[PDB]
Design a protein around this motif. Structure first.
Motif, mmCIF file in Angstrom:
data_model
loop_
_atom_site.group_PDB
_atom_site.id
_atom_site.type_symbol
_atom_site.label_atom_id
_atom_site.label_comp_id
_atom_site.label_asym_id
_atom_site.label_seq_id
_atom_site.Cartn_x
_atom_site.Cartn_y
_atom_site.Cartn_z
ATOM 1 N N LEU A 87 5.865 3.354 13.908
ATOM 2 C CA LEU A 87 6.117 3.853 12.525
ATOM 3 C C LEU A 87 6.179 2.664 11.565
ATOM 4 N N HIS A 88 7.119 1.784 11.761
ATOM 5 C CA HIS A 88 7.245 0.602 10.860
ATOM 6 C C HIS A 88 5.867 -0.022 10.615
ATOM 7 N N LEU A 89 5.045 -0.092 11.624
ATOM 8 C CA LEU A 89 3.694 -0.699 11.441
ATOM 9 C C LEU A 89 2.855 0.172 10.502
ATOM 10 N N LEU B 107 3.553 2.156 8.593
ATOM 11 C CA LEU B 107 4.223 2.244 7.266
ATOM 12 C C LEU B 107 3.882 1.010 6.426
ATOM 13 N N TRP B 108 4.229 -0.161 6.892
ATOM 14 C CA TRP B 108 3.928 -1.394 6.109
ATOM 15 C C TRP B 108 2.468 -1.369 5.643
ATOM 16 N N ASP C 163 1.685 1.389 3.113
ATOM 17 C CA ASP C 163 2.251 0.999 1.792
ATOM 18 C C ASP C 163 1.352 -0.058 1.151
ATOM 19 N N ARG C 164 0.717 -0.873 1.950
ATOM 20 C CA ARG C 164 -0.175 -1.922 1.384
ATOM 21 C C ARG C 164 -1.484 -1.296 0.900
ATOM 22 N N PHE D 297 -0.657 0.264 -3.297
ATOM 23 C CA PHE D 297 -0.802 -0.669 -4.448
ATOM 24 C C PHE D 297 -2.284 -0.994 -4.645
ATOM 25 N N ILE E 129 -3.283 -3.554 -10.514
ATOM 26 C CA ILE E 129 -1.991 -4.173 -10.936
ATOM 27 C C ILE E 129 -1.636 -3.707 -12.349
#
Ligand code: RIM
Ligand code: RIM
Ligand code: RIM
Ligand code: RIM
Lengths: 38, 38, 38, 38
Positions: free
Chosen positions: D14-16, D18-19, D22-23, D26, D29
């Protein structure tokens, strides 16, 4: 035994300490603005 | 002793080497400025 | 008997709730633009 | 079955995802600039 787990629990501690170590959050923002431009 | 841990310890080595990979982009702020504007 | 894993699974639950917790708070950009250009 | 590890390896997956996920959000800018301004 089987240090495989030992290295696993430590790898997690590393990424953790690292995350905070990077998000330390420093002040003085102008410095960054100068690094980008002149 | 099962591979479940092998994949676990490796999953950590990845997320870690990765996050650090994105942090090496330190500095280089002018590129972000020109990217936002025209 | 083998809490090493217990601490491991928990170390991940922390880093996880952390990255997310940090993503729920990061707005307020005008405050940085001012505090910087001063 | 010692599912403790199963939950651990999954917490990492999950954490993977997820990071990274999330990248991939974005994109431009100019959105962060309009957020601060006003
Ligand atoms: C690591 C960073 N995102 C912080 C650290 C501390 C806990 C969370 C809020 C604040 C202080 C920032 C997360
Ligand atoms: C991952 C990155 N923030 C760094 C890289 C080097 C090691 C750690 C401190 C400093 C230099 C920053 C972590
Ligand atoms: C952790 C945060 N970047 C979020 C959490 C949820 C999953 C991803 C999109 C959105 C909702 C934001 C990533
Ligand atoms: C999600 C981020 N670490 C990146 C983004 C781009 C694609 C992948 C490699 C590299 C460049 C880093 C994943």
């Amino acid at each position: 035994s089987d240090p495989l787990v030992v290295a696993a629990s430590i790898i997690g501690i590393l990424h953790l300490i690292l995350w905070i170590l990077d998000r330390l959050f420093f002040k003085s923002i102008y410095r960054f603005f100068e690094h980008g431009l002149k």
